[PDB]
């Protein structure tokens, strides 16, 4: 299972309840990362999400409710309910998108990690969860210095070890 998200110098991710705005470049990666397959998302996330469900992207809703539903999307309550779907759907891949509440949920199950270290700084009140970098291994990491000094980023790909 993979985890795709972007972190800045400070290591921020997003907001919890501000609704400021989203970047076009930083947004393309957030989705393009696992789009086109079984991408998980928090209930709160699936809501704000540009669309429900996503066009060409299988989404999943994680909530403590045992009756929670979604139009087209899949409804799960934890990392056990998601793996259950992906279990019956060995054709598609399982990659968690968010949110933070969902990140630390699969942190102990994630077999692969994806982080984008952006040189520039980003605002927000929500920080990234405590990842066990010691439990995982870095398989790839290279920074990309674009024209914009703040639009820079590093693509890190980690693989959970035993």
C-alpha atoms as a PDB file:
ATOM      1  CA  UNK A   1       0.000   0.000   0.000  1.00  0.00           C
ATOM      2  CA  UNK A   2       1.296   3.458  -0.878  1.00  0.00           C
ATOM      3  CA  UNK A   3       0.998   6.861   0.789  1.00  0.00           C
ATOM      4  CA  UNK A   4       1.046   9.924  -1.466  1.00  0.00           C
ATOM      5  CA  UNK A   5       1.288  13.464  -0.102  1.00  0.00           C
ATOM      6  CA  UNK A   6       3.402  16.629  -0.288  1.00  0.00           C
ATOM      7  CA  UNK A   7       5.445  18.181   2.521  1.00  0.00           C
ATOM      8  CA  UNK A   8       7.262  21.520   2.673  1.00  0.00           C
ATOM      9  CA  UNK A   9      10.361  22.704   4.556  1.00  0.00           C
ATOM     10  CA  UNK A  10       8.427  22.608   7.819  1.00  0.00           C
ATOM     11  CA  UNK A  11       6.692  19.385   6.818  1.00  0.00           C
ATOM     12  CA  UNK A  12       3.108  20.621   6.540  1.00  0.00           C
ATOM     13  CA  UNK A  13       0.354  18.980   4.479  1.00  0.00           C
ATOM     14  CA  UNK A  14      -2.949  20.844   4.501  1.00  0.00           C
ATOM     15  CA  UNK A  15      -5.619  22.583   6.561  1.00  0.00           C
ATOM     16  CA  UNK A  16      -8.329  21.236   8.865  1.00  0.00           C
ATOM     17  CA  UNK A  17     -11.017  23.883   8.487  1.00  0.00           C
ATOM     18  CA  UNK A  18      -9.917  27.131   6.850  1.00  0.00           C
ATOM     19  CA  UNK A  19     -10.835  26.771   3.174  1.00  0.00           C
ATOM     20  CA  UNK A  20      -8.189  29.243   1.890  1.00  0.00           C
ATOM     21  CA  UNK A  21      -7.301  27.916  -1.570  1.00  0.00           C
ATOM     22  CA  UNK A  22      -5.439  25.188  -3.460  1.00  0.00           C
ATOM     23  CA  UNK A  23      -2.497  25.403  -5.859  1.00  0.00           C
ATOM     24  CA  UNK A  24      -2.739  24.099  -9.464  1.00  0.00           C
ATOM     25  CA  UNK A  25       0.726  22.526  -9.560  1.00  0.00           C
ATOM     26  CA  UNK A  26       0.578  21.079  -6.044  1.00  0.00           C
ATOM     27  CA  UNK A  27      -2.948  19.805  -6.737  1.00  0.00           C
ATOM     28  CA  UNK A  28      -2.076  17.924  -9.928  1.00  0.00           C
ATOM     29  CA  UNK A  29       0.371  15.727  -8.012  1.00  0.00           C
ATOM     30  CA  UNK A  30      -1.959  15.178  -5.050  1.00  0.00           C
ATOM     31  CA  UNK A  31      -4.388  13.422  -7.397  1.00  0.00           C
ATOM     32  CA  UNK A  32      -2.243  12.220 -10.318  1.00  0.00           C
ATOM     33  CA  UNK A  33      -0.237  10.264  -7.730  1.00  0.00           C
ATOM     34  CA  UNK A  34      -2.689   7.350  -7.396  1.00  0.00           C
ATOM     35  CA  UNK A  35      -5.566   8.420  -9.674  1.00  0.00           C
ATOM     36  CA  UNK A  36      -6.964   5.770 -11.985  1.00  0.00           C
ATOM     37  CA  UNK A  37      -7.106   3.030  -9.304  1.00  0.00           C
ATOM     38  CA  UNK A  38      -8.455   2.258  -5.794  1.00  0.00           C
ATOM     39  CA  UNK A  39      -7.567   5.495  -3.971  1.00  0.00           C
ATOM     40  CA  UNK A  40      -8.670   5.797  -0.327  1.00  0.00           C
ATOM     41  CA  UNK A  41      -9.834   9.042   1.306  1.00  0.00           C
ATOM     42  CA  UNK A  42     -11.288  10.276   4.590  1.00  0.00           C
ATOM     43  CA  UNK A  43     -15.038  10.856   4.844  1.00  0.00           C
ATOM     44  CA  UNK A  44     -14.397  14.549   5.431  1.00  0.00           C
ATOM     45  CA  UNK A  45     -12.082  14.415   2.425  1.00  0.00           C
ATOM     46  CA  UNK A  46     -14.454  12.643   0.026  1.00  0.00           C
ATOM     47  CA  UNK A  47     -16.887  15.468   0.778  1.00  0.00           C
ATOM     48  CA  UNK A  48     -14.759  18.511  -0.063  1.00  0.00           C
ATOM     49  CA  UNK A  49     -13.219  16.494  -2.921  1.00  0.00           C
ATOM     50  CA  UNK A  50     -13.728  18.299  -6.290  1.00  0.00           C
ATOM     51  CA  UNK A  51     -16.250  15.576  -7.116  1.00  0.00           C
ATOM     52  CA  UNK A  52     -17.876  12.463  -5.660  1.00  0.00           C
ATOM     53  CA  UNK A  53     -16.952  10.099  -7.041  1.00  0.00           C
ATOM     54  CA  UNK A  54     -13.839  11.160  -8.946  1.00  0.00           C
ATOM     55  CA  UNK A  55     -13.722  10.825 -12.771  1.00  0.00           C
ATOM     56  CA  UNK A  56     -11.707   7.681 -13.562  1.00  0.00           C
ATOM     57  CA  UNK A  57     -10.632   7.377  -9.924  1.00  0.00           C
ATOM     58  CA  UNK A  58     -12.041   4.756  -7.553  1.00  0.00           C
ATOM     59  CA  UNK A  59     -12.511   6.515  -4.214  1.00  0.00           C
ATOM     60  CA  UNK A  60     -13.123   5.109  -0.737  1.00  0.00           C
ATOM     61  CA  UNK A  61     -14.694   6.724   2.331  1.00  0.00           C
ATOM     62  CA  UNK A  62     -13.310   6.004   5.800  1.00  0.00           C
ATOM     63  CA  UNK A  63     -15.572   6.711   8.783  1.00  0.00           C
ATOM     64  CA  UNK A  64     -16.478   5.279  12.192  1.00  0.00           C
ATOM     65  CA  UNK A  65     -20.101   4.985  11.034  1.00  0.00           C
ATOM     66  CA  UNK A  66     -21.250   1.430  10.305  1.00  0.00           C
ATOM     67  CA  UNK A  67     -23.942   2.710   7.923  1.00  0.00           C
ATOM     68  CA  UNK A  68     -22.018   5.453   6.102  1.00  0.00           C
ATOM     69  CA  UNK A  69     -22.562   5.469   2.350  1.00  0.00           C
ATOM     70  CA  UNK A  70     -21.379   7.090  -0.824  1.00  0.00           C
ATOM     71  CA  UNK A  71     -22.715   7.419  -4.369  1.00  0.00           C
ATOM     72  CA  UNK A  72     -20.430   5.166  -6.400  1.00  0.00           C
ATOM     73  CA  UNK A  73     -17.597   5.390  -3.878  1.00  0.00           C
ATOM     74  CA  UNK A  74     -16.672   2.610  -1.445  1.00  0.00           C
ATOM     75  CA  UNK A  75     -17.426   2.908   2.272  1.00  0.00           C
ATOM     76  CA  UNK A  76     -14.914   1.603   4.803  1.00  0.00           C
ATOM     77  CA  UNK A  77     -14.256   2.333   8.485  1.00  0.00           C
ATOM     78  CA  UNK A  78     -10.576   1.428   8.849  1.00  0.00           C
ATOM     79  CA  UNK A  79      -7.470  -0.013   7.191  1.00  0.00           C
ATOM     80  CA  UNK A  80      -9.056  -3.449   7.583  1.00  0.00           C
ATOM     81  CA  UNK A  81     -12.170  -2.570   5.603  1.00  0.00           C
ATOM     82  CA  UNK A  82     -10.095  -1.092   2.779  1.00  0.00           C
ATOM     83  CA  UNK A  83      -7.744  -4.059   2.513  1.00  0.00           C
ATOM     84  CA  UNK A  84     -10.916  -6.129   2.332  1.00  0.00           C
ATOM     85  CA  UNK A  85     -11.998  -4.339  -0.831  1.00  0.00           C
ATOM     86  CA  UNK A  86      -8.548  -4.452  -2.425  1.00  0.00           C
ATOM     87  CA  UNK A  87      -8.560  -8.129  -1.430  1.00  0.00           C
ATOM     88  CA  UNK A  88     -11.587  -8.839  -3.611  1.00  0.00           C
ATOM     89  CA  UNK A  89     -10.198  -6.455  -6.235  1.00  0.00           C
ATOM     90  CA  UNK A  90      -6.649  -7.774  -6.902  1.00  0.00           C
ATOM     91  CA  UNK A  91      -6.882  -6.101 -10.318  1.00  0.00           C
ATOM     92  CA  UNK A  92      -6.463  -2.534  -9.039  1.00  0.00           C
ATOM     93  CA  UNK A  93      -3.888  -1.091  -6.632  1.00  0.00           C
ATOM     94  CA  UNK A  94      -4.425   0.385  -3.163  1.00  0.00           C
ATOM     95  CA  UNK A  95      -3.025   3.841  -2.426  1.00  0.00           C
ATOM     96  CA  UNK A  96      -4.139   6.075   0.440  1.00  0.00           C
ATOM     97  CA  UNK A  97      -4.562   9.764  -0.364  1.00  0.00           C
ATOM     98  CA  UNK A  98      -5.766  11.227   2.919  1.00  0.00           C
ATOM     99  CA  UNK A  99      -6.511  12.908   5.062  1.00  0.00           C
ATOM    100  CA  UNK A 100      -4.120  13.082   8.020  1.00  0.00           C
ATOM    101  CA  UNK A 101      -6.629  11.176  10.146  1.00  0.00           C
ATOM    102  CA  UNK A 102      -6.448   8.494   7.461  1.00  0.00           C
ATOM    103  CA  UNK A 103      -2.673   8.724   7.091  1.00  0.00           C
ATOM    104  CA  UNK A 104      -1.759   7.429  10.567  1.00  0.00           C
ATOM    105  CA  UNK A 105      -4.480   4.798  10.124  1.00  0.00           C
ATOM    106  CA  UNK A 106      -2.577   2.895   7.436  1.00  0.00           C
ATOM    107  CA  UNK A 107       0.890   4.023   8.589  1.00  0.00           C
ATOM    108  CA  UNK A 108       1.266   0.566  10.150  1.00  0.00           C
ATOM    109  CA  UNK A 109       0.070  -1.119   6.945  1.00  0.00           C
ATOM    110  CA  UNK A 110       1.569   1.106   4.238  1.00  0.00           C
ATOM    111  CA  UNK A 111       4.073  -0.909   2.207  1.00  0.00           C
ATOM    112  CA  UNK A 112       5.260   2.072   0.160  1.00  0.00           C
ATOM    113  CA  UNK A 113       5.571   5.819   0.815  1.00  0.00           C
ATOM    114  CA  UNK A 114       5.605   8.836  -1.494  1.00  0.00           C
ATOM    115  CA  UNK A 115       6.533  12.328  -0.295  1.00  0.00           C
ATOM    116  CA  UNK A 116       7.234  15.576  -2.129  1.00  0.00           C
ATOM    117  CA  UNK A 117       9.628  17.814  -0.209  1.00  0.00           C
ATOM    118  CA  UNK A 118       8.762  21.287  -1.489  1.00  0.00           C
ATOM    119  CA  UNK A 119      11.490  23.902  -1.073  1.00  0.00           C
ATOM    120  CA  UNK A 120       8.897  26.630  -0.606  1.00  0.00           C
ATOM    121  CA  UNK A 121       6.765  27.034   2.507  1.00  0.00           C
ATOM    122  CA  UNK A 122       3.026  26.389   2.787  1.00  0.00           C
ATOM    123  CA  UNK A 123       0.362  27.537   5.248  1.00  0.00           C
ATOM    124  CA  UNK A 124      -1.947  25.355   7.313  1.00  0.00           C
ATOM    125  CA  UNK A 125      -2.828  24.111  10.791  1.00  0.00           C
ATOM    126  CA  UNK A 126      -2.497  20.374  10.103  1.00  0.00           C
ATOM    127  CA  UNK A 127       0.875  18.625  10.289  1.00  0.00           C
ATOM    128  CA  UNK A 128       2.012  15.261   8.933  1.00  0.00           C
ATOM    129  CA  UNK A 129       1.589  12.183  11.111  1.00  0.00           C
ATOM    130  CA  UNK A 130       4.543  10.370  12.761  1.00  0.00           C
ATOM    131  CA  UNK A 131       5.943   8.055  10.090  1.00  0.00           C
ATOM    132  CA  UNK A 132       8.218   5.134  10.957  1.00  0.00           C
ATOM    133  CA  UNK A 133      10.996   5.983   8.503  1.00  0.00           C
ATOM    134  CA  UNK A 134      13.085   3.419  10.382  1.00  0.00           C
ATOM    135  CA  UNK A 135      10.602   0.699   9.433  1.00  0.00           C
ATOM    136  CA  UNK A 136      10.600   1.747   5.770  1.00  0.00           C
ATOM    137  CA  UNK A 137      13.442   2.139   3.275  1.00  0.00           C
ATOM    138  CA  UNK A 138      14.240   4.870   0.747  1.00  0.00           C
ATOM    139  CA  UNK A 139      14.152   3.418  -2.768  1.00  0.00           C
ATOM    140  CA  UNK A 140      14.325   6.761  -4.595  1.00  0.00           C
ATOM    141  CA  UNK A 141      14.829  10.444  -3.763  1.00  0.00           C
ATOM    142  CA  UNK A 142      15.672  13.328  -6.095  1.00  0.00           C
ATOM    143  CA  UNK A 143      14.892  17.039  -5.790  1.00  0.00           C
ATOM    144  CA  UNK A 144      13.562  18.963  -8.781  1.00  0.00           C
ATOM    145  CA  UNK A 145      14.607  22.610  -8.925  1.00  0.00           C
ATOM    146  CA  UNK A 146      12.065  24.337 -11.158  1.00  0.00           C
ATOM    147  CA  UNK A 147      12.086  27.951 -12.352  1.00  0.00           C
ATOM    148  CA  UNK A 148      10.280  29.013  -9.184  1.00  0.00           C
ATOM    149  CA  UNK A 149      12.500  28.642  -6.064  1.00  0.00           C
ATOM    150  CA  UNK A 150       9.414  27.798  -4.004  1.00  0.00           C
ATOM    151  CA  UNK A 151       7.859  25.519  -6.635  1.00  0.00           C
ATOM    152  CA  UNK A 152      10.746  23.090  -6.134  1.00  0.00           C
ATOM    153  CA  UNK A 153      10.178  19.610  -4.740  1.00  0.00           C
ATOM    154  CA  UNK A 154      11.799  16.231  -4.067  1.00  0.00           C
ATOM    155  CA  UNK A 155      10.223  12.907  -5.037  1.00  0.00           C
ATOM    156  CA  UNK A 156      10.901  10.363  -2.291  1.00  0.00           C
ATOM    157  CA  UNK A 157       9.793   6.762  -2.744  1.00  0.00           C
ATOM    158  CA  UNK A 158      10.038   4.486   0.288  1.00  0.00           C
ATOM    159  CA  UNK A 159       9.407   0.745   0.537  1.00  0.00           C
ATOM    160  CA  UNK A 160       8.388  -0.917   3.808  1.00  0.00           C
ATOM    161  CA  UNK A 161      10.895  -3.554   4.912  1.00  0.00           C
ATOM    162  CA  UNK A 162      10.712  -6.489   7.325  1.00  0.00           C
END
